[PDB]
Design an enzyme around this catalytic site. Structure first.
Site, short mmCIF file in Angstrom:
data_model
loop_
_atom_site.label_atom_id
_atom_site.label_comp_id
_atom_site.label_asym_id
_atom_site.label_seq_id
_atom_site.Cartn_x
_atom_site.Cartn_y
_atom_site.Cartn_z
N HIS A 135 0.86 -1.17 0.00
CA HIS A 135 0.00 0.00 0.00
C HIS A 135 0.90 1.23 0.00
O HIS A 135 1.55 1.52 1.01
CB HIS A 135 -0.98 0.04 1.20
CG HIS A 135 -1.89 1.23 1.17
ND1 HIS A 135 -3.15 1.15 0.63
CD2 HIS A 135 -1.68 2.50 1.58
CE1 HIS A 135 -3.67 2.37 0.72
NE2 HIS A 135 -2.81 3.22 1.29
N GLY A 136 0.90 1.96 -1.10
CA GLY A 136 1.65 3.21 -1.20
C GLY A 136 0.76 4.40 -0.90
O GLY A 136 -0.46 4.35 -1.07
N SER A 137 1.37 5.49 -0.44
CA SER A 137 0.63 6.71 -0.15
C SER A 137 1.65 7.84 -0.11
O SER A 137 2.86 7.58 -0.12
CB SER A 137 -0.10 6.57 1.19
OG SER A 137 -1.22 7.45 1.26
N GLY A 192 -1.04 10.08 9.77
CA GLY A 192 -2.41 9.62 9.87
C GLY A 192 -2.54 8.10 9.79
O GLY A 192 -3.27 7.51 10.59
N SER A 252 1.72 0.05 -6.36
CA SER A 252 1.56 0.78 -5.12
C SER A 252 2.48 2.01 -5.05
O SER A 252 2.06 3.04 -4.53
CB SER A 252 1.77 -0.14 -3.92
OG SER A 252 0.63 -0.97 -3.74
N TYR A 277 1.33 5.48 -6.19
CA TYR A 277 0.53 6.23 -5.22
C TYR A 277 1.37 7.07 -4.25
O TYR A 277 0.80 7.83 -3.48
CB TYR A 277 -0.42 5.30 -4.47
CG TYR A 277 -1.55 4.82 -5.34
CD1 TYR A 277 -2.73 5.56 -5.43
CD2 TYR A 277 -1.47 3.63 -6.04
CE1 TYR A 277 -3.79 5.12 -6.21
CE2 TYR A 277 -2.52 3.18 -6.83
CZ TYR A 277 -3.69 3.92 -6.90
OH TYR A 277 -4.75 3.49 -7.66
N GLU A 298 -5.55 -6.10 -7.88
CA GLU A 298 -5.76 -5.24 -6.73
C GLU A 298 -6.67 -5.96 -5.75
O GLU A 298 -7.43 -6.85 -6.15
CB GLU A 298 -6.16 -3.80 -7.05
CG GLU A 298 -7.41 -3.57 -7.87
CD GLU A 298 -7.51 -2.09 -8.19
OE1 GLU A 298 -8.38 -1.42 -7.59
OE2 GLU A 298 -6.68 -1.58 -8.98
C1 LIG Z 1 -3.97 -0.78 -5.51
C2 LIG Z 1 -2.91 -0.24 -4.54
C3 LIG Z 1 -3.18 1.11 -3.91
C4 LIG Z 1 -4.33 1.76 -4.07
C5 LIG Z 1 -4.57 3.05 -3.46
C6 LIG Z 1 -5.77 3.77 -3.60
C7 LIG Z 1 -5.92 5.01 -3.00
C8 LIG Z 1 -4.90 5.57 -2.23
C9 LIG Z 1 -5.07 6.92 -1.59
N1 LIG Z 1 -5.41 6.95 -0.16
C10 LIG Z 1 -5.61 8.35 0.28
C11 LIG Z 1 -5.92 8.41 1.77
N2 LIG Z 1 -7.10 7.60 2.08
C12 LIG Z 1 -7.79 7.93 3.29
N3 LIG Z 1 -7.22 8.54 4.30
C13 LIG Z 1 -8.22 8.67 5.24
C14 LIG Z 1 -9.40 8.14 4.80
C15 LIG Z 1 -10.73 8.05 5.48
N4 LIG Z 1 -9.12 7.67 3.56
C16 LIG Z 1 -10.03 7.01 2.63
C17 LIG Z 1 -6.94 6.21 1.64
C18 LIG Z 1 -6.63 6.17 0.14
C19 LIG Z 1 -3.70 4.86 -2.10
C20 LIG Z 1 -3.53 3.61 -2.70
N5 LIG Z 1 -2.34 2.90 -2.56
C21 LIG Z 1 -2.09 1.69 -3.12
O1 LIG Z 1 -1.00 1.15 -2.94
#
Ligand SMILES: CCc1cc2ccc(CN3CCN(c4ncc(C)n4C)CC3)cc2[nH]c1=O
Length: 350
Positions: free
Chosen positions: A201-203, A210, A243, A246, A327
Site C-alpha cells: 500500500h503506497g501513499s 495519519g 503501489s 501512489y 488489486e
Molecule cells: C492498488 C494499490 C493502492 C491503491 C490506493 C488507492 C488510494 C490511495 C489513496 N489513499 C488516500 C488516503 N485515504 C484515506 N485517508 C483517510 C481516509 C478516510 N481515507 C479514505 C486512503 C486512500 C492509495 C492507494 N495505494 C495503493 O497502494
C-alpha cells in the site's frame, strides 16, 4: 537528544513536516490564503464529501450543466481553490468526482497529522522527534539489512516492478518493522482466516502520520461510492510499482514511503470491471480486481505463515479486464495488520 535510531528519526521528521503538508495542498489546487492548514476541519471535509455525493447524483441522473453549476460552486465554497478573480472548472463528470474524493481522502490524513502537532503538550527539554514519535502510538524498529526478512522484502521489491512502470526504478533505503498499538488485538477474528497475504500500500509521505496513528481507513459514509473503482474499502497491490505510483514522488521530491500489510482476504469476490459496491456478496471477505498480469504463483513463499507473492510478473490468463495488475480490497479495517514500512528512493529515467 533522541536515542531513537537515525533512520527512525529521519522517518519522524519526514512525516511531520508542516511545509510538505502545505505543498500537498498547493498540488491539490487549494487556496492556502482562504483555507490554511490550521483552518482544515473534519466537519468541512465531511460537508464537501456530501456535495460530491450530490454531484454524483446529478451527473448520473443527467442534470443540465446549468443545474450542476450551483452544486459545483457549493463545493468550492466549502473547499476554496486557487483561481483568484477567475471562474473555476465545472464538476460535471465522474472523473471530476473521483479526483475530488481522492483529494478529500488525502485532506483527512493531513488534518490528522496537523491535529497531532497542535493537540499535545509543549516541553523544550524533550527532543521534538521523541515527542512526535510517541504521538504515533506505533513501535518502529529498523530491520537489519542482512536478516532473512530484509532479503524476502528486497526480493519482493526487485521482482514486482512492472515493465509498464519503466519511468523509474526503486532503491530500498530503510526497512522498518511496525506494530500499531492495539492492531494485533483488532486483527484477532481474522488471524487464522485462509488466504492471508502480504501486500503493498503506497501513499504520499503527508498521509503516514495519519496511517501510523489511525491505521488504514475506509472513506466515510458521506463519501461518494462511485468515486472509487471497487467502492469504499482499503486497496492493496501485489506489484510494488502499482503501489509506488501512489507515493506521488518526483524529481524534486524522490523519496517515498510504502507499507507491507498482512491482509486476511478469505473468500475473494473476483471482478474484472468497476463495481461501486456498498457491501460484499454473502460468504465473501474481500474483492480481488483481476489483472492481465500476476506474480508467478509457483514462486509464492511464506513469511511468518503468511503468503508473499514475490514472483516475477506472468500472464494471468484473464481476458477482457479493465486492470493491467491485480488489486485487493477489504471493507473492514480489522482485516489489515500493518507489518513493515519501507523508505524508497525513486530514480527517474525521464
Ligand atoms: C492498488 C494499490 C493502492 C491503491 C490506493 C488507492 C488510494 C490511495 C489513496 N489513499 C488516500 C488516503 N485515504 C484515506 N485517508 C483517510 C481516509 C478516510 N481515507 C479514505 C486512503 C486512500 C492509495 C492507494 N495505494 C495503493 O497502494
Amino acid at each position: 537528544k533522541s536515542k531513537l535510531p537515525k533512520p527512525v528519526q529521519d522517518l519522524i521528521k519526514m512525516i511531520f513536516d508542516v511545509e510538505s503538508m502545505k505543498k500537498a495542498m498547493v498540488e491539490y489546487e487549494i487556496d492556502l490564503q482562504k483555507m490554511p492548514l490550521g483552518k482544515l476541519s473534519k466537519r468541512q471535509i465531511q460537508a464537501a464529501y456530501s456535495i460530491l455525493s450530490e454531484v454524483q447524483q446529478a451527473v448520473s441522473q443527467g442534470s443540465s450543466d446549468s443545474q450542476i453549476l450551483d452544486l459545483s460552486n457549493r463545493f468550492y465554497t466549502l473547499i476554496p481553490h486557487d483561481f483568484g478573480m477567475k471562474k473555476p472548472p465545472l464538476l460535471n463528470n465522474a472523473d471530476s468526482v473521483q479526483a475530488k474524493a481522492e483529494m478529500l481522502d488525502n485532506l483527512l490524513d493531513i488534518e490528522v497529522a496537523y491535529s497531532l502537532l497542535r493537540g499535545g503538550s509543549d516541553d523544550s527539554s524533550k527532543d521534538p522527534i521523541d515527542v512526535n514519535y510517541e504521538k504515533l502510538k506505533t513501535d518502529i524498529k529498523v530491520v537489519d539489512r542482512d536478516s532473512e526478512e530484509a532479503e524476502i522484502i528486497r526480493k519482493y521489491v526487485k521482482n514486482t516492478h512492472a515493465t509498464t512502470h519503466n519511468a523509474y526504478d526503486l532503491e530500498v533505503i530503510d526497512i522498518f518493522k511496525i506494530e500499531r498499538e492495539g492492531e494485533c488485538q483488532r486483527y484477532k477474528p481474522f488471524k487464522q482466516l485462509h488466504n492471508r497475504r502480504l501486500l503493498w500500500h503506497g501513499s504520499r509521505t503527508t498521509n503516514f502520520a495519519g496511517i501510523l496513528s489511525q491505521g488504514l481507513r475506509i472513506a466515510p459514509p458521506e463519501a461518494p461510492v462511485t468515486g472509487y473503482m471497487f467502492g469504499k474499502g482499503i486497496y492493496f497491490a501485489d506489484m510494488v510499482s502499482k503501489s509506488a505510483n501512489y507515493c506521488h514522488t518526483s524529481q524534486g521530491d524522490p523519496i517515498g514511503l510504502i507499507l507491507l500489510g498482512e491482509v486476511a482476504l478469505g473468500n475473494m469476490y473476483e471482478l474484472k470491471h468497476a463495481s461501486h459496491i456498498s457491501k460484499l456478496p454473502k460468504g465473501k471477505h474481500s474483492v480481488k480486481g483481476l489483472g492481465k498480469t500476476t506474480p508467478d504463483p509457483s514462486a509464492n513463499i511464506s513469511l511468518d505463515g503468511v503468503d508473499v507473492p514475490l514472483g516475477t510478473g506472468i500472464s494471468s490468463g484473464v481476458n477482457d479486464t479493465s486492470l493491467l495488475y491485480n488489486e485487493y480490497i477489504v471493507y473492514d479495517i480489522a482485516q489489515v495488520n500493518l507489518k513493515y514500512l519501507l523508505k524508497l528512493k525513486f530514480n527517474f529515467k525521464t
